[PDB]
Amino acid sequence: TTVNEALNNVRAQVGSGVSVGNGECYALASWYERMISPDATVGLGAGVGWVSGATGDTISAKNIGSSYNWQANGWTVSTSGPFQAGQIVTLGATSGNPYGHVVIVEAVDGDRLTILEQNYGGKRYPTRNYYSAASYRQQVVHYITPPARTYRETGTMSVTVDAINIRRAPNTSGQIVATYKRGESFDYDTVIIDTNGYVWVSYIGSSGIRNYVATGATKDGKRYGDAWGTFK
Ligand SMILES: [Cl-]
Ligand SMILES: [Cl-]
Ligand SMILES: [Cl-]
Ligand SMILES: [Cl-]
Ligand SMILES: [Cl-]
Ligand code: NA
Ligand code: NA
Ligand code: NA
C-alpha cells in the first residue's frame, strides 16, 4: 500500500456520514497511519505511545507528534512546512478543546489546502474542508510526513448511507460503474476484508464482470467504524 492508496482510502470516506473508529479526530489519523505502516509495533496506529507523553492515559491530538515514535516507522516530523499531500498535521489547543486537533493533508493548490478530518465541528465523521495555508500554518504543532481475508457468503446488503460507489475492483481508485443509494438492496456472493482498508462485498454483474462495493473501514482485520449498511 502506497501513500497515494492510503490517501485514496481516506478520500473515499467523504460523504459517508459515518465515523471511522470511535469518532475522534485521531481515529482517522490512526487508520491512515496503519494503512501506510501496517506492521509497526510502536506508534499511534499500533496503539503504543510514550506513557510519559500523556496524562490520564488519554490521547491528546496536539501532542501526537511527540507522544508517538514516528521515526521508528520511517515517518519524519517537523515544526516547519511546507504542507504536502499525505502529511498528518497536528494543531494546537484552543478555547473549548484542551487537546487540539489532528488532520490529514489531501492536496495543496497554491495557498489552498485540502484537508481530510473527523470531528472538526462536532461532525464526528470524515469531512473534506478547505483552508488557507498562510492562515492554517499558524496553528500547526507538527508536520508528520510518511516514508486481504476473503470468503464466500450469500447475503443481501441494505444501504444506510446516502450512496456507495460500485467498482470494478476492490480498491478506491477502481472507478465508478454506478452507485447504490440509501435504502436500496442488492445481493452479493463474496466478502473481502482488507486488513487495513474496507470490508468489500462482491458479485458478478450484469455484463459478466465482477463488481465490488465498499461497506465501511477496517483496521487490523476488524471493522473500524460502523458498517455502511445492514446485512442478512
Ligand atoms: Cl515512556
Ligand atoms: Cl518506542
Ligand atoms: Cl498547543
Ligand atoms: Cl453492478
Ligand atoms: Cl471480472
Ligand atoms: Na510497516
Ligand atoms: Na468507494
Ligand atoms: Na478499475
From TrEMBL:
Origin superkingdom: Viruses
Name of the protein in question: Phage lysin
Organism: Streptococcus phage phi7917
